Design a binder for this molecule. Structure first.
Ligand SMILES: Nc1ccc2cc[nH]c2c1
Length: 1111
């Protein structure tokens, strides 16, 4: 009944957890990072973090722990998902193939069970005797770690203590032993139990329980030789080992709750601690010797190290390097110095990693050009709060521009053998060559002795033995560097024209029609080594040397006319090693051997925009794993360039593209330029690390931005952004923000709201939140003005709009007055502001008797939700708001969207409702509601008949009218899908320049994931659903979780299969399965090019390409 497609535009960026150990090999130090559904694996080096493997799970990662059973040569990985999928994983590398194998799996949910309010805890015994899970209050689940237990069968033990705060397994125990903090009416306590596998029960623990601090929140199990447990609370740190109790109450920790810990030293001598304000502490355990050779704890000390990003997790990586995993701001690598700096800090930031999360609001604006949307998010919280401006594609910064038509090729040269930098740019034209010298930023034409100017150049460059080479249609010319003189010239025996050229430092391959010649470059000599006749005319050549080759290629890659083949030939024999037939009647135009992330590839571009690529074995010449992308409709020209110490490929066409690697897969990202015909890298004194680019009329020189799909600009606020709206007439954004002050009240740090150019305050007719409306310039993102709201006033909703017959555009803010003893607010305001002359004027205020959760402009009127009431206001001639009509049938109307006369209302707990304004009655009619209870987080109108909802348990659903009168009032849930993210905001728009799909709704999430929802026809839905079912049979899932299980709608109240939703991530993955798998997937499908007939792999590759470009 409803057909929707949902796909990831930006994967989650928030770090939910991190572990270190020896997973990829016994000798590697790994860092593993969980970003919701994604597991990232790195090797730690002196250099830094090397990415080795990234996988997606069909689940939200809730537990992630490395452990090493007896008999295992490296660590295994335990994962538990939020849906209670358990697995044990092993990393296997076989040559260049990397696989995550599932050693054991099973689902560990109970039948009865309310999920613990305080979350899943999973722990592993240091001796690998068992895994312990705290999933539900009153129960401790044990998975025995027998090699026979491949289904991860478990048993429950009754836990008398219902409210466990934290739990760990202790070190140095003859029986597996837990230590936990729990809360009862008498306060908080620490207790132990032994876990008996033979009795399937707890036994008495090795040390008696103790009372601990009221806010004790974390247990640390200390390794030998200490043993025992550290308990961290808000104002104290204790150590327990039974006949041993030590407690400190250091004032330095009292200001902010400590929420993460990490062991620095293997023997437990030192720990890192992080708090909610980003402070980083060292906790030091002092040893005392004993006559019997045991070691006991003499004392505990805490030292402030410095400040990081607000940390969800901390992992020491050796050599003073710490990974700071953040969910509220950017993650970091930081260095800990033995010695402090001038401010007193031991912490120096080394690297920053983007985190968009939480995305609490966003909007789409065409900031720069028409039809080019950019997303502007409210991101992060507290000192990490920011705006982020997100846009597709890679930018070029143009530093020179020369009118110079008809360029047919570009080559950089070093004319001076004792200078590292290029100083020369050689240009081809039809039948001609020109040489440009670069003196600083000046670009002067010149002659270069030895080169000819009256033939078209096909290649020129630096070659061996301090020589230059020029290959024209007439000849190969070898030139000495000092002086510049012709030292050798090669021509074909009858002086026929050269038609194609390739060259490296010491080797040349030229074609003459069907003939190939192989030359070597020697001192003052072009030596003809070998020649052959090809079966067909030669279209293109490459001899780029790959690997540890000492600059010599044993391979020649060639593309031919007629059979449209890409072939790998041996040099010098020209023996055929491998032939691939690319199909069609359009010849190959560019062919390249290249390396990305240490793997070798063959790229071959056809004249119609198709790019084929293959893995290349540089020993045997074998091509494998053919893939195909479309990069335009014109011939593509491929050229290697380096930026930021990585070789990538620039693809010149009508759609210029950079080809690069991510996670050992090739990626293709648009370059934000009009058509580029030719390019070369250029690294000159005046133009360092640059690119020369030519079109039909112009030569450009510029630098390229970071090679990535999305560009992100960060605007730090140093306080929490809450809501955003764009006001085109003022060329600014309005942003609601909140800062923490301590109780009047004192600010903790300067921030956007305290650092505006000018400021205003409402006049009254982690201690406290102070709320502000910020006015932010759309170009500079400077804070132009800040308006501070009343004490205890929280700003909840924001719109920019015109109303009534008034020509002005206003910022309008809805608020709540927040008092401690109120279950909800009973007072709030709507405030209408005008931004003029650098300041906000208050135009009008309206007191209302509740919180103004949501506002929307509605046909020149203001629609607002106020507690349980939806209200429509008119803007009168006297510039005040006046109630037109009200709707009362809500619990708490949190979310509003409108389309025409229709309003979609999202409720705290009663799902969604559809209102209509009735223009000839001047009131609302309730059209229909969804009678299924759902705890809503966001809503959107997809179209007049389809309503999208997101809810608190990470599901999407779609409601429609059911097409009685009591019947007409029941919305039907026709689409259901477990997304696995928490949606804060939906907004119509696209990041793609303005099909299988209709409409575009972007969404932003707590983890910083951005997604897209679009609509499908029944026909497309049916085809893609069939594809999913076929993909799910062939793809091996990590942990052997079923895709259908993962995507099943799931709340405490119900579990149902997904319906009416295509998983775009799964569909897009079709492009990465093997060709036999593609055949498996395609068999006996129906596809419409025409009439419904059998689909081919190539059909579906094209389809999934159409789908990828919607984001
Ligand atoms: N004891 C033991 C050893 C290896 C594995 C692999 C999965 N579960 C295990 C338990």
């Amino acid at each position: 009944m409803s057909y929707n497609y949902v796909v990831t535009a930006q994967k989650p960026t928030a770090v939910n957890g991190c572990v270190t150990g020896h997973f990829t090999s016994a000798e590697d130090l790994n860092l593993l990072i969980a970003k919701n559904t994604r597991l990232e694996i790195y090797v730690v080096t002196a250099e830094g973090l090397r990415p080795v493997k990234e996988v997606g799970m069909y689940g939200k990662i809730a537990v992630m722990e490395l452990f090493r059973p007896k008999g295992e040569s490296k660590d295994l990985l335990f994962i538990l998902t939020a849906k209670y999928n358990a697995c044990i994983l092993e990393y296997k590398q076989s040559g260049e193939s990397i696989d995550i194998i599932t050693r054991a799996h099973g689902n560990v949910q109970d039948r009865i069970g309310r999920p613990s309010e305080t979350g899943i805890i999973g722990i592993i015994d240091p001796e690998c005797r068992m895994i312990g899970l705290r999933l539900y209050d009153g129960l401790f689940k044990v998975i025995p770690l027998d090699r026979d237990n491949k289904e991860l069968k478990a048993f429950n033990i009754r836990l008398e203590e219902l409210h466990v705060i934290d739990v760990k397994f202790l070190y140095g125990c003859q029986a597996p032993t837990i230590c936990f903090v729990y809360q009862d009416p008498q306060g908080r306590h620490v207790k132990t139990y032994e876990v008996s596998l033979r009795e399937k029960e707890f036994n008495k623990g090795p040390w008696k329980q103790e009372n601990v601090e009221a806010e004790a929140s974390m247990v640390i199990a200390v390794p030998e030789p200490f043993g025992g447990a550290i308990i961290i609370g808000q104002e104290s740190i204790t150590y327990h080992n039974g006949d041993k109790y030590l407690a400190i109450a250091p004032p330095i920790i009292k200001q902010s709750t400590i929420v993460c810990h990490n062991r620095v030293d293997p023997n437990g001598s030192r720990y890192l601690l992080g708090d909610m304000e980003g402070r980083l502490f060292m906790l030091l355990l002092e040893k005392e010797e004993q006559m019997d050779g045991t070691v006991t704890l003499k004392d505990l000390r805490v030292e402030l190290l410095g400040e990081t990003s607000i940390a969800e997790c901390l992992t020491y990586l050796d050599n003073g390097v710490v990974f700071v995993g953040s969910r509220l701001g950017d993650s970091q690598l930081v260095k800990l110095n033995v010695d402090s700096n001038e401010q007193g800090s031991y912490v120096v930031a080394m690297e920053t990693f983007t985190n968009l999360g939480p995305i609490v609001d966003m909007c789409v604006v065409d900031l720069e050009r028409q039809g080019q949307g950019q997303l502007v998010t409210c991101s992060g919280a507290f000192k990490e709060g920011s705006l982020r401006i997100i846009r597709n594609g890679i930018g070029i910064h143009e530093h020179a521009s020369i009118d110079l038509p008809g360029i047919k090729g570009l080559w950089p040269l070093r004319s001076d053998p004792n200078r590292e930098t290029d100083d020369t740019l050689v240009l081809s034209f039809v039948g001609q060559t020109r040489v440009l010298m670069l003196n600083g930023e000046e670009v002067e034409e010149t002659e270069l002795m030895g080169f000819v100017d009256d033939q078209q150049t096909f290649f020129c460059g630096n070659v061996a033995h301090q020589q230059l080479i020029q290959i024209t249609s007439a000849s190969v010319r070898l030139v000495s560097q000092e002086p510049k003189a012709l030292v050798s010239e090669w021509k074909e025996p009858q002086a026929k024209n050269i038609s194609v050229a390739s060259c490296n430092s010491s080797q040349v391959v030229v074609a003459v029609g069907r003939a190939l010649y192989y030359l070597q470059i020697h001192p003052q000599e072009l030596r003809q080594i070998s020649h052959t006749e090809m079966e067909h005319e030669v279209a293109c050549l490459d001899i780029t040397p790959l690997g540890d080759s000492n600059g010599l290629s044993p391979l020649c890659a060639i593309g031919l006319w007629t059979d449209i083949s890409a072939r790998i030939l041996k040099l010098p024999s020209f023996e055929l090693l491998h032939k691939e037939m690319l199909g069609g009647e359009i010849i190959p135009r560019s062919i390249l051997m290249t390396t990305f992330e240490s793997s070798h590839y063959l790229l071959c571009a056809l004249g119609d925009g198709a790019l084929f690529y293959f893995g290349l074995n540089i020993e045997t010449g074998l091509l494998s794993d053919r893939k195909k992308v479309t990069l335009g409709t014109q011939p593509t020209v491929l050229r290697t360039f380096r930026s930021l110490s990585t070789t990538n490929v620039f693809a010149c066409s009508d759609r210029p593209t950079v080809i690069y690697s991510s996670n050992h897969k090739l990626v293709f990202s648009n370059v934000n330029l009009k058509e580029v015909n030719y390019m070369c890298p250029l690294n000159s004194d005046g133009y360092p690390d640059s690119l020369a680019l030519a079109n039909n009329s112009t030569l450009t020189i510029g630098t390229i931005d970071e090679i990535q799909k999305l560009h992100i600009r960060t605007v730090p606020l140093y306080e929490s952004p809450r809501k955003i709206c764009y006001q085109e007439v003022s060329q600014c954004f309005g942003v609601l923000s909140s800062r923490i002050e301590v109780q009047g009240t004192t600010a903790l740090r300067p921030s956007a709201s305290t650092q505006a150019l000018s400021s205003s305050v409402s006049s009254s007719k982690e201690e406290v939140e102070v709320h502000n409306l910020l006015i932010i310039d759309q170009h500079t993102f400077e804070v132009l003005h800040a308006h501070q709201f009343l004490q205890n006033e929280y700003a909840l909703s924001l719109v920019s709009c015109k109303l009534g017959k008034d020509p002005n555009t206003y910022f309008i803010v809805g608020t709540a007055m927040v008092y401690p003893e109120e279950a909800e607010p009973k007072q709030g305001r709507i405030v209408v502001f005008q931004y003029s002359d650098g300041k906000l004027q208050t135009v009008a205020e309206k007191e209302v008797k509740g919180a103004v959760y949501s506002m929307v402009e509605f046909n020149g009127k203001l629609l607002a939700s106020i507690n349980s009431t939806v209200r429509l206001y008119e803007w009168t001639t006297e510039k005040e708001l006046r109630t037109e009509c009200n709707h009362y049938n809500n619990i708490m109307a949190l979310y509003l969207k409108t389309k025409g006369d229709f309003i979609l209302v999202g409720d705290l707990m009663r799902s969604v409702l559809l209102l209509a304004y009735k223009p000839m009655e001047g009131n609302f009619e309730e059209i229909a509601r969804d009678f299924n209870p759902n705890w809503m987080s966001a809503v959107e109108i997809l179209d007049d008949d389809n309503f999208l909802g997101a809810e608190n348990a990470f599901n999407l659903f779609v409601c429609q009218k059911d097409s009685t009168d009591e019947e007409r009032q029941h919305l039907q849930e026709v689409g259901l899908f477990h997304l696995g993210e928490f949606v804060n905001v939906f907004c119509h728009g696209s990041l793609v320049m303005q099909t299988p799909t209709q409409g575009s709704v972007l969404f932003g999430t707590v983890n910083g994931m951005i997604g897209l929802v679009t609509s499908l026809s029944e026909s497309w839905y049916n085809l893609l659903l069939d594809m999913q079912n076929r993909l799910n049979k062939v793809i091996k899932s990590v942990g052997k979780i079923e895709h259908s299980f993962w995507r099943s709608f799931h709340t405490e109240r119900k579990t149902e299969p997904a319906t009416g939703f295509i998983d775009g991530d799964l569909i897009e993955s079709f492009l990465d399965i093997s060709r036999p798998k593609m055949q498996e997937v395609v068999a006996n499908l129906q596809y419409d090019d025409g009439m419904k007939r059998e689909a081919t792999a190539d059909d579906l590759i094209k389809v999934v390409e159409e789908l990828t470009r919607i984001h």
